[PDB]
Nucleic acid binder design. Structure first.
Ligand SMILES: [Mg+2]
Ligand SMILES: [Zn+2]
Ligand SMILES: [Zn+2]
Lengths: 729, 71, 157, 95, 593, 315
DNA sequence: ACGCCAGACAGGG
RNA sequence: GAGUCUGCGGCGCGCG
DNA sequence: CCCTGTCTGGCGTTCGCGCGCCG
């Protein structure tokens, strides 16, 4: 039950703090019994989100709780419901138990109300998990807010009403994986809880009582309140999150500033201005490109890398320990016994790497020297040493190196020596050495980004601002999303955010559309109408009218059915803009793209790059002690699994040797992999497979049991798997 | 690396933030089907719109000559 | 150097248990802390299973590959790597017999079906708890002639 | 895709046999010296860092290019198992 | 040859294109086709960007008729209510009738929306994607422009109130919650089907892995006849099986015997191409052929393996199957993928000989049928003036055979699913096999999957690679042993060594799982069932695992008995005219003195 | 019997059960030699008998546990040989390749079914031994050990090494795998075209064979070592040669969702407005009038006009 | 918790 | 003329 | 003593990859 706090981004941690699991003591619910439990039962209303549950085998069983849901006295998730005696609604609320809720006739919040009076004779209400059209006279209780129906996590989706629940889920879960960008911007379109999340979560630092500001350090903000007191508020400069993300508090208050009680003094890891912010608001064209956005691929404008727009600081904490071997203590020094000084520059402090030093894959982070053999020296290594220089340090290089993949700059270092202050050093552990490395993760092709609705995908190509889709005015788009990924999935919500986002771009305003009660299609068309004066209005005054391009697309457009034939291009373009679509030129050819294409400000986040991302390619390396199959860990990537599902795939094909190869030379054939390597170094023809150790290990396992497994020849006679170690003496 | 502890920064070398062109119909006495190209260029200040335009036309001309020696 | 064309599971003869066997583990002595070395004859002794080290021996009379297939005159250590230690088998000589659970608790009791006994309950009855048998001849009575194969108790015995 | 795979497929009785052939031919191409080919002169294998593929890039890429010609001979039992490796070392130099 | 195989008379759909690839594959050659693919790939992609197709909120267009059909159906709902408030309709009737009102009204809005796009917006972004093989689903479109109307409760009983909204307009607070229940069961369902889809691929492989093509045209000509017509959709009316289905049965097959149809002479052993199977259908149309004699794995002679003439065409390539192709797996796989889309529970009941939920009493006797009227239990009797096979048909069972006509052995005397064991007893094995096959295809068909019968046959064969003994020779009577191993016994006991000790056996039907559990080698058995049991027995009896089959021979890390390890091609030498002469010079030197 | 941390030692649970048996057999030997009171002899032979089960198979009858720490059945020999992740299953599925790799996939539009974009950085490790030798064939490195050290650090790679790799992969191909390997096309062979970065470029048309879209799916990569394995891998396992599916004789290289949208759009015919007569089929005044009426606003370029709408008359 | 197969024993002639 | 030894079982979560 | 029926006894339950923790 207790696990690592998922603090990818504060919202994540907050979510991992309140979610409800089924599996546990074992007394409650087991794992192969679940179809009944997994479903979203009727009573889960306002008590459990129907959306927050995970996709996968453990479905419907592990889930975070709802909005106002609160455990009362004994584990019964209750929920708020306002009272309504007669046709009058109160501002009074009763957190009701799941059982008590059944006894009453509760109504929805959407019910037209003039204050305390219901306003429509036949208004909706739900008796007991049964939708029922009740009269204002029977309305005993009313819902607090549509919010309560879902969790915090989901409440963050702009037009959740227009998104299929199955994808909404993926949208909720995605927020929990958002990574803190140096530049945090709040969505151009919000739900209403972004403020609350950063506040109830402990991201930003708020002002206790009213006062003025004294000092504004990059490290501390000591305010002076009006009651005659003054406090110094340190700020977690740069701290290592569990998940390796940056947690910095950036002061937003200037020196000598009268602050209101409960005002942001500093912004949390991912807040803009007290608002929750993960990933950034980018202009986006929703059209297809060559094949760069095929099934779920995304095209990124190099321009986004120019201004550090998707950049993330990452901290990986490599660590090494000076163990005490009965062969001689493992020393930690600048001495790397065998080959170069060029690899010992960065290692400036004797042993430790210097701070602010660029560490690339394969560089020494920390040096260490242990002893060469198990117990004895070497007869063949004794001659080599003596030939060029007998007096060769017998100590072996076992130094903490940068594991393949990446390192960055060394920012902090920690060393616990002999006379420990108040630390717990494990036995054998002479001393420890932590090395904190940080690195800016500019957005690259490997990375994956996704919007709050569910559209997930990876970056296929970083196009030069030179030729990607550009608007009538020089402003080019940042990302180009593939339309095809919207029909199949059902999330028009994204198409709605982009429209509203379009208006905000030329109207210069951010918005807040509640969950079920937010903005409406008519209201957005209205704002876009305002946007048209911003966009085309300055165009008229600046000195120019419509393009041949702009007119051509219009023809094709009216022939399509997007503009009422017979109106003036000025009036026509407006009608087309209101549609949420504008004219765009290719950027490569300068010719327009036949047919209006929508564009807008869609909030998109970058996802956490696990060590799963940082690709694993393995040539040769470690092997397991009992099973002789390939394995890695620290620096040697580790072999991929070939699975029977895949064996069959090759079985199907006439791939005989390719399969033999997988089962012998590449994984288990001890003598084979060896001869294999050597042969390839030579440019020779690999030898022919010797028996695999798994078989050998199996026969004996089977021999451990009374059973006798003997291999046989043409005529049923012996043959020998174990080359000669089984005969006795 | 001027100083060993200095930190490099990302390079942004385009003196132009955005370019825009429109092709509106223009009248020449005899035939009405004609093009008029007006391109608006914005610059950070380092260089001027005119200076940029000229350099631009030059890079295009320099590339048009690369069609000289067949093979 | 031949190709393995047929594999075959067969029951093990006690003599065969000994034949594949190298040494007998006769004491519960894993490894004595002071020296991470195998304690006594125990479960990890190297005679019974194999060279704790590379090509080298015990004491060190012969230490390389030139004499790979010969044993030390004073100490018996033939050596390849420590693999000879991971392929060899050891046997334990039990006092009074016990049976394979694989053969006695499989749905159809291979011994229960073969031996006409209560397929599943008579077995469990005398295997784990208390009931005794007469092998060749026992001229005197219980009340009836000697039981050639039947079983008697300690009290009437 | 690859050069005349259809042609290739058509020259054998069974798909998986062609594979055996091409593989066993690339082997011999390396082993007894890489000059053991049947069509080097005018048009032949080529790579472009230089035109150097003429010496040792891919083995079977050649085997294929040869088998696509009617020079080689692949049978179930064409030439007695051991006498082939003897006469092949006798006549082909490169080591 | 490019205009010979293309249709420029219609917009290029995924199917028109699908068919252009296939044609191009057969006509011009493999690699040349690959060229065509990339070509389409390149232009499809380019034209795509330029086309400017994009989803817009307004692009999803709501029919003006939605308002009507909803109101029309709304008022009708009141009529159903007023009709119950009087006491005319039973509590149930009310419900079932209301469902039917929406079930139809929703489908009504469906065709309506499309009708709008078809007549007024042919080039609608959302629409065109759906029409083009691109992206979209008729049911999905509806949820955006039309309305997603009925979402069932937790249990399964659909809700009485529909979801009057579309995704275009605000799906309300509750309609969302209501619809949530279904999404959750869907996600739980998908999770348990994925596990069971991989398991089915494991079991199919456990029994068909050994099946590999290693042959010479097996000479035992006992073939299967691919029916082209189906019996009861409507009681009794003969009909031409679906184009799809029939194609699935005769495409790329090898005729067992010569058939003269509409004028052409389809020779024996000829592999009928898709065009040929188009011919036979057109002929059945005219009325010249009711069946089709065709070789099939169901009747191969090769004990362990299947030959070229029996399997057929389909290698990954369109020509006959190359000897040395792992068919067992290839079959096991083609069945295990589509499964994840299914439903599946039946497919399991089918591969595993079982007694399904709704059993149907099969007529063990073939005579005619007759029914009775007494109170409690009804009764369907297959009778003769000699005897009747009493078939107890309780209250809930719906019998469709009537008082009067004939009923062959193993014929449905009750309605629903059937028990393989009984059907085996009544109508025989040649009937079980064909039952299983068709009854399995029934599910994938109904789900869009199009898999060739070849595969389900390969598998089902193995379900019956075993039989019981009733007249001994070598070993005692009651025994379940390998069918072909008896064909061996009986063959040499009558042919080579005299004394006709007929080995009378009984066809035994077993499920994929039990055939794998209980097979010859143990290595294979040690893999799934109970390693514990499998080994026990295999030990007792010193069992020599003769390595044949890919499962057992993979464990050893030895070469695959199938593939290149194919004894057919494991040995093949290559020559240069230069070494051909040199070896001949070696023969010439053989002349002594 | 291994050294874990600080002094912690881990030994396979089999030993705890072996101790059990040894101890009991011994104590029994001693209990029979000392003096034998029936009750105590049986009481032990029982425990003895149970012990013997323990190593063979634990759980058939009761389940032995390591003392208060983990109520876990000590993995008995049967357990080691059986199940999903057991010993018989480790053999059959042989699970871990030496020359393997895996990364996130990303669409490679220009790529031809024939090839796949593989990260050079990934290649370097993948084809390392093949590269080492090639280093020596050239002047970049004196010997293998040399060539290895040359590559143990990322800032030490001369641009010449990439030339060498690019050269070593010339005509060799690699296999690609997808999350669930459902059919034979679950794995396909392609020609690696070295590319920059993390992601692996995959061809769009094959995206149908392996159930794979680009929201983050990751595909594994292996390398055929033998000249035999490579042969088969590029002859009968490459992508471009396995176009039809083993299930149905229908293609699997069918244009996907993106391709078809494009190829459709281009081939469709449009229809617009018929208010005035649509009969050019017969009158010659119908050609004139409906051709001038089109020039006007009345007849569209695509009118329901049987034989030819004015759109055909004009051009 | 479940589902399924195979099993050994006990009740009614 | 380099090669040893460690990373297991399970648990939790997340992607596909 | 036979055949039939009922509880009874033993086994099984996608695949791959990340990360992190623990004796
Ligand atoms: Mg995906
Ligand atoms: Zn010695
Ligand atoms: Zn056959």
């Amino acid at each position: 039950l207790s696990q690592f706090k998922d603090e990818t981004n504060p919202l994540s941690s907050l979510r991992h703090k309140r979610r409800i699991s089924a599996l546990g003591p074992g007394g409650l619910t087991r794992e192969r019994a679940g179809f009944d439990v997994r479903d979203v039962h009727r009573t889960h209303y306002g008590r459990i989100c129907p959306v927050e549950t995970p996709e996968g085998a453990n479905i419907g069983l592990i889930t975070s709780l709802a909005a106002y849901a609160r455990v009362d006295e004994l584990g019964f998730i209750r929920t708020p419901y306002r009272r309504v005696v007669g046709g009058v609604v109160t501002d009074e609320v009763v957190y009701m138990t799941a059982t008590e809720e059944d006894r009453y006739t509760i109504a929805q919040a959407n019910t037209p109300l003039e204050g305390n009076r219901i306003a429509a004779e036949r208004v909706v209400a739900r008796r007991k998990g049964e939708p029922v059209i009740v009269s204002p006279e029977e309305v005993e209780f009313m819902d607090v807010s549509p919010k309560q129906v879902f969790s915090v996590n989901t409440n963050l989706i702009p037009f959740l009403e227009h998104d299929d629940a199955n994808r909404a889920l993926m949208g909720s879960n995605m927020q929990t994986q958002a990574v803190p960008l140096i530049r945090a911007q709040a969505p151009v379109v919000m739900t209403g809880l972004e403020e609350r999340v950063v506040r109830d979560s402990l991201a930003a630092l708020y002002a206790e009582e009213d006062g003025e500001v004294a000092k504004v350090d990059g490290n501390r903000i000591v305010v002076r309140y009006e009651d005659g007191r003054l406090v110094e508020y340190p700020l977690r400069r740069f701290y290592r999150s569990n998940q390796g993300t940056a947690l910095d508090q950036r002061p937003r208050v200037v020196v000598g500033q009268r602050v209101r009680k409960g005002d942001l003094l500093a912004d949390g890891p991912a807040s803009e201005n007290g608002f929750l912010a993960l990933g950034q608001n980018v202009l986006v064209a929703i059209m297809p490109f060559d094949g760069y956005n095929f099934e779920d691929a995304i095209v990124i404008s190099e321009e986004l890398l120019k201004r550090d727009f998707y950049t993330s600081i990452h901290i990986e904490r490599y660590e090494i320990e000076a163990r005490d071997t009965k062969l001689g203590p493992e020393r930690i020094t600048r001495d790397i016994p065998h080959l170069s000084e060029a690899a010992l520059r960065d290692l400036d402090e004797e042993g430790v790497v210097r701070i602010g030093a660029e560490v690339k894959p394969g560089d020494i982070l920390v040096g260490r020297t242990s002893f060469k053999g198990e117990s004895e020296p070497t007869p063949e290594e004794r001659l080599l040493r003596s030939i060029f220089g007998e007096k060769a340090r017998d100590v072996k290089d076992t130094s903490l190196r940068v594991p393949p993949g990446e390192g960055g700059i060394v920012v902090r270092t920690v060393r616990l020596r002999r006379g420990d202050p108040g630390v717990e050093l494990k036995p054998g552990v002479r001393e420890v050495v932590r090395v904190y490395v940080a690195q800016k993760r500019k957005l690259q092709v490997g990375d994956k980004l996704a919007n709050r609705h569910g559209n997930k995908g990876v970056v296929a190509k970083i196009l030069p601002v030179e030729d990607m889709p550009h608007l009538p005015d020089g402003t080019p788009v940042d990302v180009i999303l593939n339309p095809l990924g919207v029909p199949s999935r059902m999330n028009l919500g994204q198409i709605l955010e982009t429209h509203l986002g379009l208006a905000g771009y030329f109207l210069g305003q951010r918005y807040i559309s509640p969950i079920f009660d937010g903005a409406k299609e008519p209201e957005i068309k209205e704002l876009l109408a305002q946007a048209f004066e911003v966009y085309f209005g300055k165009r008229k005054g600046e000195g120019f009218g419509v393009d041949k391009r702009e007119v051509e697309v219009l023809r094709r457009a009216e022939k399509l059915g997007l503009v009422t034939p017979g109106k003036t291009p000025e009036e026509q373009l407006k009608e087309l803009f209101l549609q949420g679509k504008v004219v765009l030129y290719d950027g490569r050819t300068g010719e327009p793209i036949e047919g209006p294409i929508v564009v807008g400000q869609m909030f998109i986040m970058k996802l956490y790059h696990m060590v799963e991302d940082k690709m694993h390619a393995r040539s040769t390396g470690p092997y397991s002690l009992i099973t002789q199959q390939p394995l890695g860990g620290k620096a040697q990537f580790g072999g991929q699994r070939f699975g029977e599902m895949e064996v069959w795939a090759l079985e199907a094909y006439g791939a005989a040797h390719t399969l033999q190869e997988m089962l012998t030379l590449k994984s288990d054939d001890i003598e084979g992999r060896n001869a294999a390597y050597e042969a390839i170094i030579k440019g020779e023809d690999v030898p022919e497979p010797s028996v695999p150790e798994s078989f050998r290990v199996l026969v004996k396992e089977l021999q451990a049991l009374a059973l006798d497994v003997q291999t046989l020849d043409e005529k049923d006679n012996p043959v020998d798997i174990f080359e000669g170690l089984a005969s006795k003496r | 690396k001027d100083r060993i502890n200095a930190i490099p920064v990302d390079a942004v070398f385009s003196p132009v933030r955005r370019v825009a062109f429109q092709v509106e119909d223009t009248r020449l006495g005899q035939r009405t089907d004609l093009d008029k190209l007006t391109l608006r260029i914005w610059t950070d200040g380092s260089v001027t719109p005119l200076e940029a335009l000229n350099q631009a036309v030059e890079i295009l001309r320099e590339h048009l000559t690369y069609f000289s020696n067949p093979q | 150097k031949k190709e393995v064309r047929k594999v075959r599971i067969a029951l093990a003869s006690p003599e065969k248990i000994r034949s594949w066997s190298y040494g007998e583990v006769e004491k519960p002595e894993t490894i004595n802390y002071r020296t991470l070395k195998p304690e006594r004859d125990g479960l990890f002794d190297e005679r019974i299973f194999g060279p704790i080290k590379d090509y080298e021996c015990a004491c060190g009379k012969y230490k390389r590959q030139r004499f790979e297939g010969k044993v030390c005159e004073r100490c018996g250590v033939e050596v390849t790597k420590s693999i000879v230690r991971r392929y060899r088998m050891g046997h334990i000589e039990l006092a009074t017999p016990a049976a394979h659970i694989w053969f006695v608790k499989d749905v159809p009791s291979k011994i229960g079906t073969l031996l006409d006994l209560s397929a599943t309950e008579l077995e469990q009855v005398l295997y784990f708890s208390k009931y005794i048998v007469l092998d060749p001849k026992g001229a005197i009575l219980n009340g009836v002639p000697v039981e050639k194969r039947q079983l008697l108790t300690d009290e009437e015995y | 895709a690859e050069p005349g795979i259809d042609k290739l497929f058509g020259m054998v009785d069974s798909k998986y046999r062609l594979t055996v052939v091409v593989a066993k031919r690339a082997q011999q191409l390396l082993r007894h010296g890489f000059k053991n080919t049947v069509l080097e002169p005018e048009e032949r294998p080529k790579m472009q860092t230089l035109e150097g593929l003429f010496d040792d890039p891919n083995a079977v890429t050649w085997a294929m290019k040869e088998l696509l010609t009617g020079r080689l001979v692949f049978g179930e039992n064409l030439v007695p198992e051991d006498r082939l490796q003897k006469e092949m070392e006798r006549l082909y130099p490169v080591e | 040859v490019a205009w010979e195989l293309i249709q420029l008379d219609v917009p290029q759909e995924k199917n028109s294109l699908k068919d252009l690839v296939y044609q191009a594959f057969l006509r011009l050659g493999m690699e040349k086709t690959a060229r065509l693919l990339d070509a389409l790939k390149y232009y499809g992609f380019t034209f795509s960007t330029t086309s400017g197709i994009t989803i817009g909120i307004d692009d999803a267009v709501i029919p003006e008729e939605k308002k009507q059909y909803l109101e029309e159906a709304d008022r009708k709902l009141l009529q159903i209510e007023q009709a119950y408030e009087m006491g005319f309709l039973t509590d149930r009737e009310r419900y079932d009738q209301i469902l039917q009102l929406w079930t139809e009204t929703t489908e009504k809005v469906t065709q309506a929306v499309f009708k709008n796009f078809e007549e007024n917006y042919p080039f609608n972004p959302l629409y065109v994607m759906a029409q083009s093989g691109a992206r979209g689903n008729p049911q999905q479109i509806r949820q955006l422009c039309g309305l997603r109307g009925l979402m069932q409760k937790p249990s399964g009983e659909t809700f009485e109130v529909p979801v009057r909204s579309s995704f275009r307009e605000g799906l309300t607070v509750l309609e969302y919650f209501i619809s949530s229940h279904g999404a959750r069961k869907g996600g739980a369902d998908t999770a348990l089907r994925t596990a069971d889809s991989g398991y089915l691929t494991r079991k199919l492989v456990d029994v068909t892995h050994e099946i590999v093509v290693r042959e010479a045209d097996c000479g035992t000509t006992n073939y299967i006849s691919v029916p082209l017509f189906q019996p009861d959709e409507v009681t009794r009316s003969l009909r031409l099986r679906k184009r799809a289905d029939i194609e699935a049965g005769l495409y790329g097959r090898v005729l067992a015997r010569e058939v003269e149809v509409l004028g052409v002479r389809l020779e024996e052993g000829r592999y009928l191409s898709m065009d040929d199977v188009h011919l036979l259908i057109k002929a059945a149309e005219a009325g010249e052929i009711q069946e089709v004699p065709v070789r099939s794995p169901l009747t191969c002679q090769t004990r362990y393996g299947v030959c070229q003439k029996c399997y057929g065409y389909d290698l990954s390539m369109a020509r006959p199957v190359s000897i040395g192709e792992a068919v067992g797996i290839v079959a096991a796989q083609s069945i295990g993928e589509p499964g994840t889309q299914l439903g599946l529970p039946r497919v399991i009941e089918l591969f595993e000989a079982r007694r399904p939920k709704a059993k149907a009493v099969i007529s063990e006797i073939d005579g005619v049928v007759r029914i009775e009227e007494t109170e409690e239990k009804l009764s369907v009797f297959v009778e003769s003036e000699g005897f009747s096979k009493e078939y107890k048909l309780p209250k809930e069972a719906r019998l469709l055979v009537k008082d009067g006509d004939y009923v062959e052995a193993g014929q449905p005397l009750t309605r629903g699913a059937i028990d393989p064991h009984q059907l085996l007893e009544a109508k025989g094995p040649e009937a079980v096999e064909r039952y299983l096959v068709e009854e399995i295809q029934k599910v994938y068909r109904a789900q869009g999957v199009k898999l060739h019968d070849k595969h389900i046959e390969i598998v089902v064969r193995q379900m019956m690679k075993y039989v019981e003994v009733t007249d001994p020779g070598d070993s005692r009577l009651l025994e379940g042993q390998v069918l072909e191993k008896w064909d061996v016994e009986a063959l040499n006991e009558r042919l080579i060594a005299e004394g006709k000790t007929p080995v009378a056996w009984k066809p035994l039907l077993m499920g994929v799982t039990k055939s794998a559990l209980s097979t010859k080698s143990w290595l294979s058995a040690a893999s799934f069932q109970n390693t514990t049991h499998v080994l026990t027995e295999a030990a007792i009896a010193g069992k020599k695992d003769e390595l044949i089959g890919l499962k057992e021979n993979v464990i050893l890390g030895r070469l695959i008995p199938a593939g290149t390890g194919s004894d057919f091609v494991r040995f093949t030498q290559v020559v240069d005219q230069k070494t051909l002469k040199a070896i001949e010079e070696a023969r010439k030197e053989a002349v002594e003195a | 019997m291994v050294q874990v941390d600080g002094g912690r030692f881990a030994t396979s649970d089999l030993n705890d059960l072996y101790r059990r048996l040894i101890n009991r057999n011994n104590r029994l030997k001693k209990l029979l030699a000392q003096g034998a009171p029936e009750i105590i002899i049986r009481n032990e032979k029982r425990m003895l008998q149970e012990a013997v089960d323990a190593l063979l198979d634990n759980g058939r009858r009761g389940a032995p546990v390591t003392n208060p720490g983990s109520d876990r059945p000590l993995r008995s020999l049967t357990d080691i040989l059986s199940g999903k992740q057991g010993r018989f299953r480790q053999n059959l599925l042989g699970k871990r390749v030496d020359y393997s790799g895996r990364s996130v996939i990303v669409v490679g539009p220009q790529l031809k079914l024939h090839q796949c974009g593989l990260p050079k950085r990934m290649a370097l490790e993948l084809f390392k031994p093949f590269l080492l030798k090639k280093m020596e064939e050239k002047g970049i490195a004196p010997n293998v050990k040399a060539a290895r050290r040359m590559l143990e650090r990322q800032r030490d790679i001369k641009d010449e090494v990439w030339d060498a790799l690019e050269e070593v992969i010339h005509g060799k191909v690699v296999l690609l795998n997808r999350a669930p390997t459902l059919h034979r096309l679950g794995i396909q062979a392609f020609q690696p075209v070295l590319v920059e970065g993390q992601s692996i470029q995959l061809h769009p048309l094959v995206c149908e064979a392996f159930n794979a879209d680009f929201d983050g799916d990751q595909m594994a990569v292996h390398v055929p070592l033998s000249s035999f394995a490579q042969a088969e891998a590029r002859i009968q396992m490459l992508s471009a040669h396995n176009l039809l599916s083993p299930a149905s004789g229908e293609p699997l290289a069918k244009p996907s969702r993106d391709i078809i949208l494009g190829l459709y759009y281009i081939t469709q015919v449009r229809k617009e407005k018929k208010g005035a007569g649509l009969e050019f089929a017969t009158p010659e005044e119908a050609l004139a009038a409906h051709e001038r009426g089109e020039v006007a606003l009345n007849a569209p370029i695509k009118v329901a006009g049987r034989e030819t709408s004015v759109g055909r008359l004009k051009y």
